């Protein structure tokens, strides 16, 4: 009997008189709580279609909310979602997002959210209907719960779809999402808002836009928050944005928090914390100072020890040290701290196996920076940091005469470059020259690369200040190539190469 009224009500919804259409909409609205009448409207394509057309057309808000609410109730069942879907439900609902009447707006956004969640093919529908831009524009509202629903939709849509990301990007999404993170305290909201940003951060072109809005800073306010899922999202997001944001201001609090995050028991948080700092201290002196000033050096040291064999933690940690140990005020203070905190012995052990190139690559560079400090010369030597360092240079030079993501050329460079600084100490020169390094120190001058030549002359510059060393060089035949590098257009290569021959001139 109930199935006989439906084909009648349909007729009524289509009626012209907006006095009875309201009535029809009201009765239909009431026939949404009954498991029978619902499954009767639901299973009637002409009925559901009639409702959708009415909703978006009947400008009488009292009717628009009855119809919208009706569809809202159909979005709890698979057959309901399907009816809504195949009846052009999405495009209409998307259009209803422009309704100035909150009751209507809430029905739409909510139902849409259900559709996206459980109805397959709903994502394209919202995308095609200009839903992305309309949602991003709705990030102006101050309703924490409404924002939570809207931000989750965007995430669902943006996940796996590059175009959606580019769209959100162009819609000013980054600026809006950032404001939520730095305005609202509602966890659910903040959490789902981060998930959105996480999805956006993987996109190269989306990355900068986020950093400009002040994403780095905003994400750092919640690294302390109780919510595990919230923190674990800001870490993954920052580890993505990090490499880019080497120009930002007011990063202290963040840098500081990242430092003490290196202490968390959760090894996974320590991993991100280090990976992030490694990128923020890269060619950024202000970030290097800030880190050292909050005891960053000491922390990273502990991190390395606490890591151990696992190169997943040591790699980012070492790079961060490699950074903090040069080109700023507390550069010296940093080189001392690494020694003072008993980090020298362990670092050398990192050159030796079973370590890999990506690790060895960073370790050598750090040793170079640690050699700058005079009070590190002796300690480093004692740890056999010379025999093993050159040992790796020999194995690195053979592989270029005849990997793991690292080219052997720059490995050959890092070795010699470190030995340069690590030759200011007299005792060091003795060991260096006592391991027959001169013969191959000359072949480095025949290197096509300007970098290899630049350090190949600097090391011999330190060795040349001796007598028993200046002769072994000329006896090998290095007196000729040195004369050639005098003209090298490279500003650096032409500086040491000149001082080398000179040292052999005034004995």
């Amino acid at each position: 009997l109930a199935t006989r009224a439906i084909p009648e009500l349909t007729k009524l919804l289509n009626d012209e008189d907006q006095v009875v259409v309201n009535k029809a909409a009201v009765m239909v609205h009431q026939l949404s709580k009954k498991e029978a009448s619902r499954h009767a409207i639901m299973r009637s394509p002409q009925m559901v279609s009639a409702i959708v057309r009415t909703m978006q057309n009947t400008n009488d808000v009292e009717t628009a909310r009855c119809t919208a609410g009706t569809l809202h109730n159909l979005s709890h069942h698979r057959e309901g979602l399907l009816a809504i879907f195949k009846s052009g439900g999405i495009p209409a609902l998307v259009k209803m997002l422009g309704s100035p009447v909150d009751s209507v707006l809430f029905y739409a956004i909510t139902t849409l959210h259900n559709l996206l969640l459980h109805q397959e093919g709903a994502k394209m529908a919202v995308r095609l209907a200009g839903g992305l831009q309309k949602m991003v524009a709705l990030l102006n509202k101050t309703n924490v719960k409404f924002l939570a629903i809207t931000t989750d939709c965007l995430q669902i849509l943006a996940y796996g779809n590059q175009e959606s990301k580019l769209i959100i990007l162009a819609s000013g999404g980054p600026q809006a999402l950032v404001n939520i993170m730095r305005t609202y305290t509602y966890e659910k909201l903040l959490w789902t808002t981060s998930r959105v940003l996480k999805v956006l951060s993987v996109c190269s072109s989306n990355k900068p836009a986020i950093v400009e809005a002040g994403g780095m800073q905003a994400l750092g306010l919640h690294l302390t928050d109780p919510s595990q899922r919230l923190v674990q999202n800001c870490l993954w997001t920052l580890r993505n944005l990090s490499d880019a944001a080497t120009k930002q201001e007011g990063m202290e609090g963040l840098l500081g928090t990242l430092v003490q995050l290196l202490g968390s028991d959760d090894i996974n948080v320590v991993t991100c914390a280090a990976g992030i700092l490694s990128n923020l201290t890269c060619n950024n002196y202000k970030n290097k100072m800030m880190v050292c000033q909050v005891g960053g050096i000491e922390a990273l040291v502990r991190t390395v020890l606490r890591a151990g064999d696992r190169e997943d933690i040591t790699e980012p940690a070492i790079c961060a040290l490699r950074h903090l140990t040069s080109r700023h005020q507390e550069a010296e203070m940093a080189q001392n701290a690494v020694r003072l905190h008993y980090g020298l012995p362990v670092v050398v052990k990192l050159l030796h196996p079973p370590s890999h190139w990506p690790l060895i690559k960073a370790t050598v560079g750090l040793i170079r920076n640690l050699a700058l400090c005079p009070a590190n010369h002796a300690p480093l030597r004692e740890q056999g940091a010379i025999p093993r360092l050159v040992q790796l240079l020999v194995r690195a030079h053979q592989d270029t005469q005849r990997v793991e993501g690292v080219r052997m050329e720059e490995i050959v460079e890092g070795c010699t470059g470190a030995l340069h600084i690590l030759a200011r100490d007299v005792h060091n020169r003795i060991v260096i020259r006592g391991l027959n390094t001169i013969p191959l120190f000359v072949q480095l001058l025949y290197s096509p690369i300007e970098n290899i030549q630049r350090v190949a002359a600097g090391v011999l510059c330190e060795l040349a200040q001796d007598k028993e060393a200046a002769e072994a060089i000329e006896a090998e035949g290095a007196t000729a190539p040195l004369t050639e590098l005098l003209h090298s257009r490279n500003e650096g290569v032409a500086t040491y190469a000149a001082a080398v021959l000179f040292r052999m001139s005034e004995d």
Binding site: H72, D102, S103, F106, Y107, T110, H113, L117, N143, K145, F146, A148, I149, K188
Partner: peptide, 15 residues
């Protein structure tokens, strides 16, 4: 609690 209602019963349904 209107029309806030609408969002609150929905949140419960999902989150």
């Amino acid at each position: 609690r209107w029309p806030q209602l609408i969002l609150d019963l929905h949140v419960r349904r999902v989150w």
